[PDB]
Amino acid sequence: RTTSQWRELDAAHHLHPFTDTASLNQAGARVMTRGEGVYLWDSEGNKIIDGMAGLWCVNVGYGRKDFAEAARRQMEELPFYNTFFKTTHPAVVELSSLLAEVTPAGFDRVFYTNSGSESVDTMIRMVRRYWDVQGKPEKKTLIGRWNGYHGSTIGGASLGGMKYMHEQGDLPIPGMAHIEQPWWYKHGKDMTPDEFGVVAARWLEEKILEIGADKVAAFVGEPIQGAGGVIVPPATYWPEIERICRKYDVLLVADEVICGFGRTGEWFGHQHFGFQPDLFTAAKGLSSGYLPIGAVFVGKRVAEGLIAGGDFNHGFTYSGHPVCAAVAHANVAALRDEGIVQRVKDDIGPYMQKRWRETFSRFEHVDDVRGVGMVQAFTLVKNKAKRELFPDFGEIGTLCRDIFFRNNLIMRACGDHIVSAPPLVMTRAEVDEMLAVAERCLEEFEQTLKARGLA
C-alpha cells in the first residue's frame, strides 16, 4: 500500500484519540510503519527520533524479538482464559509473583486491567469500597488537581483536571474535587520553589477543610504531571501532601502510569519524591507498550480492607490476559536483569539531565528547563525576566512541535510546554543526536518568532 492509499483508508474508517478528525482527514495522517531502538520509520522512508517512546511507554525501546517470542509461545499454548470463574493461569500468577519482587515493600497484591484509564477507575471503586468496609460510607470524595491527567474513562477524566475533557461528557462525576497544580513558573509569585511547594501542598489541607475530612476518601496525583507538561513539583511538595493526607485520615494515591517502571531512575516516581502511597496505578512501561496491560498495586492497608469486604464486583474480560501478562513479565525481568532502571538512575539519567540543561538554558524564549531521570521539559515563554507566557497558551507550542515533526524528531507540546520521554535504553550518543536536532529546531523557532514580530 502507498502513503496516499493508507491515508485515504485512515480518513474514511478511523476515529483517532484526542484528534480534530475533520482537520486530520484533510491534512493526512503520518503513517508509522517500523520501529527499532529509539527510531521509527514512516511510509515515506523518513527515519524519526522518537523522543516520546511511543506515548511515554516504550521504555526498553522498539525491536525486542524476545518479547514477540514470549507472545507467540503464550498465544499458542493458551491465548486467553478468564480470572472470573475461581480460575487463574500460569502467565498471570508468574507476573503477579515477579511484580511483588520489583515493587516497594508492602505491595504484595495486584489487580489487572487493560489500560491506565481502567486502573484509575479500578482505584476509584477500590478507594470507595475500602471506606464502605470501614463503616464510613460518607468518605467518598477523591481530590485531584487542575492540569492533572488520570486517563480518559469517565472516572479518570473526572479525577483528571483537564477542562477541555470535563466539557465533553458533563464531568466531573460526583465525589470529585480539584486543587491548583504546583506550577511554580505561573503561581510562584515572589516565593522560592521550596516556599511555593509548602503553599501548593497546603491547598490540599484548605480543600479538605472546605469539604470536611469525614467526606474525603483520597488525594490522587502523578508524582510528575505528564500530559499537563512535565510539571515537576518542588522538593517540599510531596512530603507536605503526605503529612496532610495522614493528618486527615485520607488515602494517598500515586498515579505511576508514566513515572512507573523506571522513568525517574527509581522504579516508581513516589520513591524519587519520597512518599509512601496506599495504592498506585500503572500501565505504559509495565509492558513497554508491547501489549495492553495495566494494574493497581494495592498496599497492605487497602488490600486487607478489600479482602475483609467479600465480593469486589469489578473487573474486565481481559484482566490478567495470558499473552499480555507473558510480555509484561519479559519486560519487567528485562528492566531488572539487564540493569535498565539502574542505568537511568546512575548513568543515562544524569547525562540526559546535564545535557538537557546545557542545550536549552541559553534560549531567549525558553525557561523552566527541568527534568528527572529520563523525563524532561521546558516552557516556551514571551519574556523570561517577567515570567510572561505567550497568549493563547498552546498556539506557540504547536508551532514548535510542527518544526520538530518536520525535522523527524518527536517531542510533544503540552500547551507551550515542550516535553520528552524517550526509551530508557537511549545511549549517550542518541541523547546528543536528539538534542542536536532539537537545538537546530529551537534556533529556527526563534528566527520565525522574530520574523513574525511575536518575539
Place this chain on the structure above:
Amino acid sequence: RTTSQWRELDAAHHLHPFTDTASLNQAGARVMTRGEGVYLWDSEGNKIIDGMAGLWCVNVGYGRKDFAEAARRQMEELPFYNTFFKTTHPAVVELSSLLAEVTPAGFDRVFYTNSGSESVDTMIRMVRRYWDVQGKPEKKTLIGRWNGYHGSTIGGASLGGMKYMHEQGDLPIPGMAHIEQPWWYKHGKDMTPDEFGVVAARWLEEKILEIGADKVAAFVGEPIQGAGGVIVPPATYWPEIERICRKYDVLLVADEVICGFGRTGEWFGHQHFGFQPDLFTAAKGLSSGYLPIGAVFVGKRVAEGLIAGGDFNHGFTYSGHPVCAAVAHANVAALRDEGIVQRVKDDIGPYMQKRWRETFSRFEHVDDVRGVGMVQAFTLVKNKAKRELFPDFGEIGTLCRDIFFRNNLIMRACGDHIVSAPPLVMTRAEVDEMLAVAERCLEEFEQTLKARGLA
C-alpha cells in the same frame, strides 16, 4: 510448578475480577494451562469442555497458530505506535478497512479501545458530545435496564443495572436511568411473550416522559442480555424500543460486546432482532479474546456530529494497538473467509438450538429453555406450573454451576439462569458431547436439590 505452588502464589499476589478473594484464597484457584479447539486442560490434567468460550469471546476456538504468527510478525515490525499525534500505522488502517466490509451499512468509522468497558465509556462521552454539538446540552441522560450489563468502568457499571455493582463506588453517576428488563418468565403475568414485549418496550416511553424527552440522550441495550442470564426479549420488543427512541429524538445504542462477531448467527445481535442503532459497542469476539481490543462502531449521523465538533478529547494510549489490530484483522477475516458466521446461521446454530431444547425441556426444575445461534440458556425453577423461582436467586444456580465444573464442563450461572456460549466453530459431535455432560449434571443437580430439602 505444581498445582499447590501456583495456588500459593495466586493467593499471595493476585486480586481477581468479580471474586470473593478471602474465599478463593482458602478454596484454591483452578489453574487453566492449555487450550485447543473447544477444550481446556487444567494443572491436574483434566480435559474441560469450554461451553463459555473463555468469557463469551473465543469465537474461533483455541489453538489458532496463524493468530500467534500475525502477533509475532507485527510485534517485531512495530509493537506500538500511538494514534494521537496526527499519526496512524498499517495494522489499524487495515483493520478499520476490513471492519467496514463486515459491519452493517452506514458503519464506516470506528473508534478503538482495549475493552468492552472502555467502548461503553467512549459511547457515553460520544452520545453526550453529539447532543452538545446539536445545541442540546440538556440531552445527556442515557437509559439502560435493571440486570443489563455494560462493563465495569464507573460509566459502564452506572449504565449497567447490577445493584451489586452500583453499591460499590456510589453508582450510578448522574444522567443515568433504568427501566425493568423484558424478562417474561418473572414479569409476563398472563400476557403472551409478544404482548409482554410491547409492554416491556413501553416502559422506555414511560421513563422518557417521566424524565422529559429534552433530557434523554440515548437508550442502550444488549440485543440479548448476557451476564444477566441470556434474557432473550420477545420479537415485538426491539421494533417498539426503536419506534419509541425515534419518536422522542433519542439515540439508540446496541451493546454488541457479547452478541457481536457472529454469536446469534448474524454478524451483530441488532441484525437478528431487526433494529438500526446509531452506535454499537464491541470487544470479545472482535479478536476472539486472543488480544485485548474493543471498538465503538459509529453510524453516519453521530460520526458527522462528532466530526462537526472539532477535537474529541477522548482515547487510550493503546487505542488501535498494532499487535491487537493485526490479531483482530486475522480473526475477522477468518470469521468471514472460513464461513464461521454463515455456519452459525445456516448449520451449527439450528442444530445447537434444536438439541438444546431436546435435552433440557424434560427436567422438572428447568424452564424457559431458550437461545439463538450459539448463545443458549435455561432457568432452574422451584415449580414450572407456577413459574415459581427458588428463593435467594443465585444460590441454586451456584449449586448447579459447581456440579458442571466438577464434571469438567464450563457453563455459567447468572443468578439461577444457566448459560452457554461455546466457540462458534464447535462441531455437531462437540455439541452432543457437551449436552451429554450437562444432562448427567442436571440429573445429579435435581437429586442434590431434594437431598438438601430445597426442592
